[PDB]
């Protein structure tokens, strides 16, 4: 309806305005007039807004700009005129706007720049002239814009770069020269040396090719260039001559992504000894040779996601990676090889990578069915900490498969098709292991020695793996004294022994939802009820949802003094014994939704309700009498505990007089 002012910032966006407001407070610093129907900006209308530092008039229909406007606003730093109809500029236009740091002129249908319109902009940092119809980089006839750091000229009609067109930047230090989506066909000799210092050049979506890229790099020789981006530039092949001009530079970043790059010739990057970050993702490399990556001894990061050619099904055009292809990268720490069709891991695939700490091989192979005692031999001399092996259709893990990985901390084997018995010999050599993910696999059968060789383990995830023999004596988890997180959810488990978690005093998170443990907590269970939560003094989060519980023994939560969150929703509970929650002095969240609860009495819920933050007891068949709900309604009226959907989803069932009536509106005066 009108403008909203908050902390001297006026938001007048999307209000269909044809005139500039005259009733706004005289102390505003920022004025946002975006997405309106303004045709002009007269000086007289801005006389009362002399404190402005920022003016955003983007997405309007302004064609002329009055020079006197900048004299009325002496503190103006940011001016945004994007998406307007300001096609013609003159020397008078920005002549009085001396304190500007940012000037945005995108999508204004500017086709020609005459004379010197930016000569008075001595403090300008960013100039954005993108999405116009310019056919040249010439913006003046004399040395100006000395403090400029960013020049954006993307999506224009520039066909050639000359030195006498960029010579006005002779005293400038450009961190960014954005020339993307311009169909440049010639780089005239000396064109980049016309700028004082050039640090970054962007030529994405520019059809260059091998021959023109070679000429471009010759023009970059002896410049200050650190970053070069040539993404989607149709670089089909590379040779030992393509980047030769870059020998006379200290380039640290190169991006060659999305180029449909098929052949990478020997010694292609021998001229880049200072390169640190290399992006090669989304290409079509058919065969990587042993000398393709020669000379890249300083690279710390390499992205090879979807870099190799796809499977042809018929022609058998599978990608090939020669042995020793990574031996040159002595400083490589992070390697991403995700989503490829590589056949397997050869004996010398990763040899020479003496500084590798992170390696992701997620969905990297066609099928890596079996992990043998030799599969990872080439990583023996790498200080590898993280290994991701998801989505590879792995079926079997044999003995001593990870013996070469003595420094490994995180091992992700989730989302595969593993179906075997875990003997325990699979984990030999993993002396520094912190976490193992084994979730979403075919089947895993445990024994008493399954995790004996890894007593350092702190986190174990075994979700949806059709887990068998967890009821072994002694427990498969017994040697894991330092365990903090255990996920045994979605396994349809029916039997567990008393001592399953004995000695695990440091356990903090236990997930047991979607199993069949109901019988174990019924009083008539042969041998008595199973007290599997005994001694878990540091337990903070416990999930017991969807187990079909209809009985809870009085002493099961006895030792849980530190418990903060308990989830017992989606069960069939009604009658709960007195003092079942008596030792829960740290409870902050209680969930008992979609159960069969009729009575909510003090002798049960009193200690649990004391200092709660959240409560969820929605969708229960509440009994609306005095002996069943009086205390609960009295608690609801005076508590600060957040109870979501209280008015709508907390209804009475029995007696038929109160059927469908909210429990919040009950009368306690009769009790
Ligand atoms: C091994 O390598 C694989 C492959 O790279 C990694 O897999 C990625 O794992 C992460 C984490 O599990 C995945 O991200 C999660 O994606 C979920 C997808 O659902 C999205 O929902 C939103 C709407 O909310 C939509 O906008 C999206 O389009 C998706 O449909 C997403 O639900 C989830 O959100 C999480 O947000 C925060 C985390 O910031 C959590 O607190 C919250 O609970 C919630 O779970 C994640 O973003 C990712 O999709 C996986 N990538 C692929 C391609 O599979 C493994 O993680 C790697 N292993 C390790 C240990 O690093
Ligand atoms: C870039 O790679 C090319 C390979 O395609 C290199 O060119 C090849 O250079 C070798 C010498 O190092 C040439 O071999 C020599 O040929 C002469 C004449 O026949 C012979 O007398 C020598 O005994 C030797 O065999 C080879 O012919 C040549 N290949 C070509 C271009 O035909 C080139 O040197 C590399 N450039 C650099 C140094 O980056
Ligand atoms: C089990 O853990 C103890 C204690 O580890 C410390 O606390 C953890 C929560 C985590 O923060 C670790 O980084 C801490 O070191 C380990 O005992 C320590 O062992 C190391 C090496 O021998 C050494 O610092 C001390 O001897 C111990 N320090 C303490 C806290 O007593 C123990 O080694 C772990 N069990 C394993 C890995 O088998
Ligand atoms: C700047 O403010 C002036 C008011 O001083 C606006 O001019 C008036 O515009 C209305 C509506 O078009 C006319 O009815 C008046 O005759 C104009 N002058 C008078 C007497 O106030 C002007 O439109 C404003 N500029 C914009 C477009 O923001
Ligand atoms: C910015 O303008 C606002 C609005 O005029 C000023 O806030 C007013 O401050 C006086 C105190 O002298 C109050 O009596 C008014 O009620 C305030 N107006 C409202 C409703 O916001 C503010 O002082 C000016 N400068 C700032 C932000 O310090
Ligand atoms: C690449 O970086 C090196 C520095 O490691 C630059 O060489 C130095 O340049 C400064 C200033 O010109 C001299 O004072 C040093 O003596 C040079 N160090 C030596 C001996 O190499 C080199 O100029 C940079 N390359 C480019 C083209 O800028
Ligand atoms: C040159 O390119 C590098 C790319 O490595 C830029 O540095 C990254 O900048 C992004 C900003 O989005 C950060 O998220 C990364 O963490 C940076 N990488 C690292 C580790 O430095 C850099 O900004 C570019 N320009 C410069 C400073 O030369
Ligand atoms: C890239 O250079 C390597 C040199 O390391 C070439 O590999 C040689 O291939 C021939 C047969 O084609 C063998 O006889 C040599 O033994 C190989 N060299 C060694 C010692 O590895 C490779 O052919 C070149 N790739 C191409 C074809 O461009
Ligand atoms: C937990 O919740 C209780 C119940 O509201 C808090 O009650 C005590 O502190 C209140 C605020 O300081 C006092 O107004 C109450 O009188 C007092 N209750 C009594 C008599 O014990 C309690 O502070 C919360 N946290 C604590 C300290 O356990
Ligand atoms: C550019 O820098 C040179 C060297 O410091 C200086 O002599 C010259 O005056 C500068 N150009 C101008 C006028 O900005
Ligand atoms: O979603 C978090 C985790 O879920 C499973 O454990 C996956 O195997 C793992 O890769 C993922 O990071
Ligand atoms: O199972 C025998 C005993 O196990 C635990 O100590 C229970 O807290 C206790 O009530 C029970 O009698």
**Cβ–Cβ contacts within 10 Å for residue 170, how many?**
14
Cα distances (angstroms) measured from residue 55 to each of 43, 51, 99, 330, 380? 13, 11, 13, 51, 60
Ligand 10 centroid, distance to 115 Cα (angstroms): 21
Ligand 12 centroid, distance to 553 Cα (angstroms): 10
Give the Cα separation of 30 and 597 in Å (integer): 57
238, 260 contact by CB (below 8 A): no
User: Which domains does the chain carry?
Assistant: 1-671 (3.80.10.10)
Q: Which residues line ligand 11 (CB under 6 A)?
A: 390, 412, 414-415, 437, 439-440, 461
Resolution of this entry, Å: 2.4
Best probe residue, ligand 8, of 238, 290, 324, 325 (max atoms within 8 Å of C-beta) = 290
Q: Is the CB of 482 under 6 A from ligand 3?
A: yes
Alpha carbon distance, N-terminus to C-terminus of the chain: 52
Cis peptide before 330 (omega within 30 of 0): no
Q: Please provide the DSSP assignment of 97-135 as one string.
A: -TT-SEEE-TTS------S-TTTT-TT--EEE--SS---
Ligand 1 centroid, distance to 46 Cα (angstroms): 49
Ligand 5 centroid, distance to 606 Cα (angstroms): 49
**Residue among 203, 297, 299 at smallest CA distance from 258:** 203
This structure was determined by: X-ray
Write the residue with the smallest CA distance to atom 20 of ligand 5. 5
Question: Which bound ligand lies closest to the C-alpha atom of 481?
Answer: 3
Q: Is the CB of 455 under 6 A from ligand 3?
A: yes
Q: Which residues line ligand 7 (CB under 6 A)?
A: 199-200, 226-227, 253, 277
Give the Cα separation of 481 and 503 in Å (integer): 6
Chain-centroid distance of CA 598 in Å reads 45
98, 121 contact by CB (below 8 A): yes
Q: Is the CB of 173 under 6 A from ligand 10?
A: no
Give the Cα separation of 617 and 45 in Å (integer): 59
Best probe residue, ligand 6, of 250, 251, 271, 275 (max atoms within 8 Å of C-beta) = 250
Coil, helix or strand for 36? coil
What atom in ligand 3 is closest to the CA of residue 456?
Answer: 37
Tokens matching residue 601 = 């009495």
Q: Is the CB of 639 under 6 A from ligand 9?
A: no
Q: Is the CB of 40 under 6 A from ligand 4?
A: yes
- Residue 161 is classified by DSSP as B
**Residue among 250, 356, 337 at smallest CA distance from 288:** 337
Ligand 6 centroid, distance to 247 Cα (angstroms): 13
Q: Which residues line ligand 1 (CB under 6 A)?
A: 338, 360, 362, 388, 390, 412
What atom in ligand 7 is closest to the CA of residue 199?
Answer: 28
Q: Cα–Cα–Cα angle for 442, 443, 444, nearest 5°?
A: 140
Q: Cα–Cα–Cα angle for 577, 579, 580, nearest 5°?
A: 65
Ligand 1 centroid, distance to 394 Cα (angstroms): 21
Q: Is the CB of 274 under 6 A from ligand 6?
A: no
Facing residues of 104 across strands? 80, 128
Coil, helix or strand for 577? coil
Strands (DSSP E) contained in 403-537 are: 410-412, 419-421, 435-437, 443-445, 459-461, 485-487, 509-511
Give the Cα separation of 214 and 243 in Å (integer): 6
Give the Cα separation of 68 and 601 in Å (integer): 77
Ligand 12 centroid, distance to 533 Cα (angstroms): 11
Give the Cα separation of 614 and 284 in Å (integer): 53
What atom in ligand 3 is closest to the CA of residue 506?
Answer: 9
Give the Cα separation of 59 and 65 in Å (integer): 15
Cα distances (angstroms) measured from residue 601 to each of 374, 569, 606, 643? 63, 18, 8, 18
**Cβ–Cβ contacts within 10 Å for residue 303, how many?**
19
70, 92 contact by CB (below 8 A): no
Give the Cα separation of 498 and 506 in Å (integer): 18
Q: Is the CB of 297 under 6 A from ligand 6?
A: no
Tokens matching residue 620 = 């229960």
Task: Name 483's Cβ contacts closer than 8 Å, sequence gap at least 6.
Answer: 457, 458, 459, 460, 477, 504, 506, 507
Question: Which bound ligand lies closest to the C-alpha atom of 263?
Answer: 8
Task: Name 587's Cβ contacts closer than 8 Å, sequence gap at least 6.
Answer: 563, 564, 566, 581, 608, 610, 611, 612
**Residue among 39, 23, 141 at smallest CA distance from 84:** 39
What atom in ligand 12 is closest to the CA of residue 529?
Answer: 1
Q: Is the CB of 469 under 6 A from ligand 10?
A: no
Q: Please provide the DSSP assignment of 272-331 as one string.
A: -TT--EEE--S--B-EE-TTTTTT-TT--EEE-TT-BPPP-SSS----EE-TTTTTT-TT
Facing residues of 650 across strands? none
Chain-centroid distance of CA 607 in Å reads 41
Q: HEC profile for 525-543?
A: CCCCCCCCCCCCCCCCEEE
Write the residue with the smallest CA distance to atom 8 of ligand 10. 171
Give the Cα separation of 179 and 250 in Å (integer): 21
In the chain, count H helices and then E strands. 4, 38
Q: Which residue has the tokens 């050639």?
A: 160
Ligand 4 centroid, distance to 86 Cα (angstroms): 21
Give the Cα separation of 192 and 173 in Å (integer): 12
Tokens matching residue 274 = 């200072």
Ligand 12 centroid, distance to 612 Cα (angstroms): 28
**Residue among 89, 45, 96 at smallest CA distance from 65:** 89
Ligand 1 centroid, distance to 418 Cα (angstroms): 22
Kindly give the residue spans of alpha helices, DSSP state H, lying in 188-260.
210-219
**Residue among 182, 194, 175, 123 at smallest CA distance from 153:** 182
Q: Please provide the DSSP assignment of 62-101 as one string.
A: -----GGGTTS-TT--EEE--SS------TTTTTT-TT-S
Q: Is the CB of 432 under 6 A from ligand 3?
A: no
Question: Which H or E run contains 589?
Answer: strand 589-591
Question: What is the dihedral sign for C-alpha 650, 653, 655, 659?
Answer: positive
Tokens matching residue 266 = 């020997």
Pairing of strands 102-104, 419-421: unpaired
Give the Cα separation of 82 and 110 in Å (integer): 12
Q: Is the CB of 48 under 6 A from ligand 4?
A: no
Tokens matching residue 308 = 């190799």
Strands (DSSP E) contained in 117-236 are: 126-128, 150-152, 173-174, 176-178, 197-198, 200-202, 227-229
Coil, helix or strand for 199? coil
Write the residue with the smallest CA distance to atom 23 of ligand 5. 27
376, 402 contact by CB (below 8 A): yes
Q: Cα–Cα–Cα angle for 49, 52, 54, nearest 5°?
A: 135
**Residue among 286, 414, 434, 290 at smallest CA distance from 352:** 290
**Residue among 424, 364, 423, 374 at smallest CA distance from 394:** 364
What atom in ligand 9 is closest to the CA of residue 610?
Answer: 2
398, 426 contact by CB (below 8 A): yes
Give the Cα separation of 76 and 41 in Å (integer): 15
Facing residues of 238 across strands? 264
What atom in ligand 8 is closest to the CA of residue 290?
Answer: 5
Facing residues of 566 across strands? 542, 590
Task: Name 100's Cβ contacts closer than 8 Å, sequence gap at least 6.
Answer: 76, 77, 78, 79, 94, 121, 123, 124
Q: Is the CB of 90 under 6 A from ligand 6?
A: no
Counting every residue, how long is the chain?
Answer: 671
What atom in ligand 8 is closest to the CA of residue 322?
Answer: 21
Write the residue with the smallest CA distance to atom 26 of ligand 4. 19
Burial (0-12, 13-18, 19+ Cβ within 10 Å), 104: buried
* C-alpha R_g of the chain: 35
Question: Which bound ligand lies closest to the C-alpha atom of 415?
Answer: 11
Burial (0-12, 13-18, 19+ Cβ within 10 Å), 46: buried
Tokens matching residue 193 = 């040396």
């Amino acid at each position: 309806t009108k403008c909203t002012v908050s902390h001297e910032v006026a938001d007048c966006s999307h209000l269909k305005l044809t005139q500039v407001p005259d009733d706004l407070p005289t102390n505003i610093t920022v004025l946002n007039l975006t997405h309106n129907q303004l045709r002009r900006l007269p000086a007289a209308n801005f006389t009362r807004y002399s404190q402005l530092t920022s003016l955003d008039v983007g997405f309007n229909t302004i064609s002329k700009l009055e020079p006197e406007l900048c004299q009325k606003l002496p503190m103006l730093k940011v001016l945004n005129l994007q998406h307007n109809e300001l096609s013609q500029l003159s020397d008078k236009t920005f002549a009085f706007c001396t304190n500007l740091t940012e000037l945005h002129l995108m999508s204004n249908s500017i086709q020609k720049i005459k004379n010197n319109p930016f000569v008075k902009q001595k403090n300008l940092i960013t100039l954005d002239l993108s999405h116009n119809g310019l056919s040249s980089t010439k913006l003046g006839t004399q040395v100006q814009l000395e403090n400029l750091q960013e020049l954006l000229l993307s999506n224009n009609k520039i066909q050639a770069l000359k030195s006498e067109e960029l010579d006005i930047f002779a005293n400038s230090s450009l961190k960014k020269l954005e020339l993307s989506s311009n169909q440049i066909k010639e780089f005239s000799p000396g064109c980049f040396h016309a700028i004082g210092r050039l640090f970054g050049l962007f030529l994405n979506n520019v059809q260059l090719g091998p021959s023109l890229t070679e000429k471009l790099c010759l023009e970059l020789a002896n410049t200050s260039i650190r970053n070069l981006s040539l993404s989607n530039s149709q670089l089909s092949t590379t040779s030992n001559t393509t980047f030769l001009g870059l020998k006379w530079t200290n380039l640290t970043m190169l991006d060659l992504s999305y180029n449909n790059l098929n052949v990478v010739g020997n010694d292609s990057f021998a001229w880049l000894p200072q390169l640190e970050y290399f992006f090669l993702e989304y290409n079509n490399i058919q065969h990587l040779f042993s000398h393709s990556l020669h000379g890249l001894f300083n690279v710390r990061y390499l992205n090879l996601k979807r870099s190799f050619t796809k499977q042809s099904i018929s022609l058998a055009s599978l990608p090939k990676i020669d042995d020793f292809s990574f031996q040159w990268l002595k400083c490589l720490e992070h390697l991403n090889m995700e989503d490829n069709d590589i056949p397997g891991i050869k004996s010398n695939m990763f040899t020479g990578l003496i500084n590798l700490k992170y390696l992701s091989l997620s969905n990297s192979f066609t099928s890596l069915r079996t992990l043998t005692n030799e599969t990872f031999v080439s990583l023996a001399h790498s200080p590898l900490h993280i290994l991701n092996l998801t989505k590879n259709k792995i079926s079997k893990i044999e003995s001593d498969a990870f013996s070469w990985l003595g420094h490994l901390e995180v091992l992700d084997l989730g989302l595969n098709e593993i179906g075997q018995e875990l003997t325990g010999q699979e984990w030999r050599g993993l002396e520094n292991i912190f976490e193992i993910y084994l979730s979403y696999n075919k089947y895993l059968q445990l024994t008493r020695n399954s995790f004996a060789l890894v007593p350092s383990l702190q986190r174990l995830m075994l979700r949806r793996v059709a887990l068998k023999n967890v009821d072994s004596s002694p427990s498969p988890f017994q040697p894991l004294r330092n365990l903090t997180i255990l996920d045994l959810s979605n396994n349809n488990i029916a039997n567990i022994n008393d001592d399953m978690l004995e000695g695990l005093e440091k356990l903090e998170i236990l997930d047991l939802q979607h199993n069949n443990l109901a019988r174990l907590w019924k009083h008539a269970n042969p041998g008595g009820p199973i007290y599997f939560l005994k001694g878990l003094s540091h337990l903070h989060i416990l999930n017991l949802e969807s187990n079909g519980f209809d009985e809870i023994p009085v002493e099961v939560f006895k030792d849980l003094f530190e418990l903060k969150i308990i989830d017992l929703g989606l069960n069939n509970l009604n009658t709960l014994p007195a003092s079942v929650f008596n030792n829960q002095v740290s409870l902050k969240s209680l969930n008992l939704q979609k159960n069969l609860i009729t009575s909510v009495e003090k002798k049960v819920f009193g200690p649990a309700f004391r200092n709660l933050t959240e409560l969820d007891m929605r969708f229960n068949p509440f009994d609306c009498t005095c002996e069943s709900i009086a205390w609960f309604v009295n608690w609801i009226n005076e508590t600060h505990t957040n109870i979501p959907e209280l008015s709508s989803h907390y209804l009475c069932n029995t007696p038929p007089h109160y059927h469908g009536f909210p429990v919040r509106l009950f009368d306690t005066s009769s009790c």
